Amino acid sequence: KDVSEYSCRELHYTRFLTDGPCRSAKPVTELVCSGQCGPARLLPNAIGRVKWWRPNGPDFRCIPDRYRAQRVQLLCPGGAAPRSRKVRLVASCKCKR
Numbered sequence: 001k002d003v004s005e006y007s008c009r010e011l012h013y014t015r016f017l018t019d020g021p022c023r024s025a026k027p028v029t030e031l032v033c034s035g036q037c038g039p040a041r042l043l044p045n046a047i048g049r050v051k052w053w054r055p056n057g058p059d060f061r062c063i064p065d066r067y068r069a070q071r072v073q074l075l076c077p078g079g080a081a082p083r084s085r086k087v088r089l090v091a092s093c094k095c096k097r
Contacts, residue, residue, distance in 0.1 A: 016074075023075065031092075062093055
């Protein structure tokens with residue numbers, strides 16, 4: 001896997017699903033595709049005045065491609081109003097732009 005070649009290596013996270021005053025907590029695996037893979041070239045366009053944007057560097061990172069399907073119900077205090085929610089987790093992504 002050329003995923004670890006740059007950033008966002010084989011990383012795993014635990015995010016399931018949250019909705020109306022309730023939340024799910026079923027085991028879920030997701031990758032955190034966030035890193036750097038773009039030029040550090042700064043583009044000066046202050047057209048005289050710089051306030052809006054600033055040459056602090058371009059925003060580049062890994063880009064999620066495909067996600068894994070996760071079907072878990074959100075649990076509420078006391079388990080009385082549980083709900084089902086779908087969640088797509090980038091089980092595979094590439095570091096682009």
